[PDB]
């Protein structure tokens, strides 16, 4: 068996649901330890083992409440999800990256939920400059299992040398972070690094500010495949089982989880 596998066999309905199969709880975290604090969401059921973790950053002038719907929606699929606040509203993309890594370190070493977490199975995500943060974090910490960038503004616009499986969302109508920019970004990812690109039809830059089934139902498979090695979820992306709301999809299917570290 896959020792990291959690939860029942999925369906299209189960990955699209507002709440998944796991009951969840949260705890607030105050400012400190290198970042602005935030909220940790987690499954309360311990009987299937520890869960992997995801830290999520807002963008410039953003706070976690603006995108907080991700917290319980993702956690209830069997993940520990840390939505962060930044030290300052005007923090840079590389700064957001620093703070995502600081949040993951706090999650693993000091948080009240650290006993529920598998500290070897962590990921990063974010919106806009927070997505740039997530990508920059991935470049710095290749042991991360996954990175998800929503309209990610990475100043360099290059992922050369990235080893972390990366999912990028582009908003069709966005001009701050246009699809053309995000196409170029995707195309810098090394051929040996698993990757995907999804353009959302009719979406503006701040589409993610409202709950989105289109986002949730494609993010959840990505996290399951790469954080949990859980190829029960490959059926949602390889091929794309439902193209509702998606203008363009590119990926390196079949999506194969990273090999286990050398003994
Ligand atoms: Ca592949």
Numbering used by the authors: 2 to 264
From the paper:
In recent years, biocatalysis has emerged as a promising recycling methodology for poly­(ethylene terephthalate) (PET), an abundantly produced plastic, due to its potential to selectively depolymerize the polymer under mild conditions. , A number of naturally occurring hydrolase enzymes have been discovered that catalyze the conversion of PET to its constituent monomers, terephthalic acid (TPA) and ethylene glycol (EG). − Most of these PET hydrolases exhibit promiscuous activity related to their native functions as cutinases, lipases, and carboxylesterases. In this study, we use the term ″PET hydrolase″ to denote enzymes with demonstrated PET hydrolytic activity, acknowledging that the observed activity of these enzymes is very likely promiscuous activity. All sequences shared a catalytic domain with the Asp-His-Ser triad within the conserved α/β hydrolase fold, as shown by the alignment of Cα atoms for each Alphafold2 predicted structure against LCC-ICCG using mTm-align. In this study, we applied three consecutive rounds of machine learning and high-throughput (HTP) experimental characterization to discover PET-active hydrolases.
To provide a basis for structural investigations, we selected the most performant enzymes from our Round 1 candidates that also expressed well in the small-scale experiments. Expression of these enzymes was scaled-up, and one enzyme, DP043 from Actinoplanes sp. DH11, was successfully crystallized, with the crystal structure being determined using molecular replacement. While multiple AlphaFold models have been shown to closely correlate with independent crystallographic models of these compact α/β folds, we wanted to validate this here. Alignment of the DP043 AlphaFold3 and crystallographic models shows close alignment, including side chains, with an all-atom RMSD of only 0.266 Å and accurate prediction via Alphafold3 of the location of the Ca2+ ion observed in the crystal structure. The crystal structure revealed a Ca2+ ion, a feature known in other PET hydrolases which has been targeted for rational engineering due to its role in stabilizing the protein. The Ca2+ in the crystal structure of DP043 was not located in the same position as observed in the engineered examples, such as LCC and TfCut2 and further studies would be required to evaluate if the Ca2+ in DP043 serves a similar purpose.
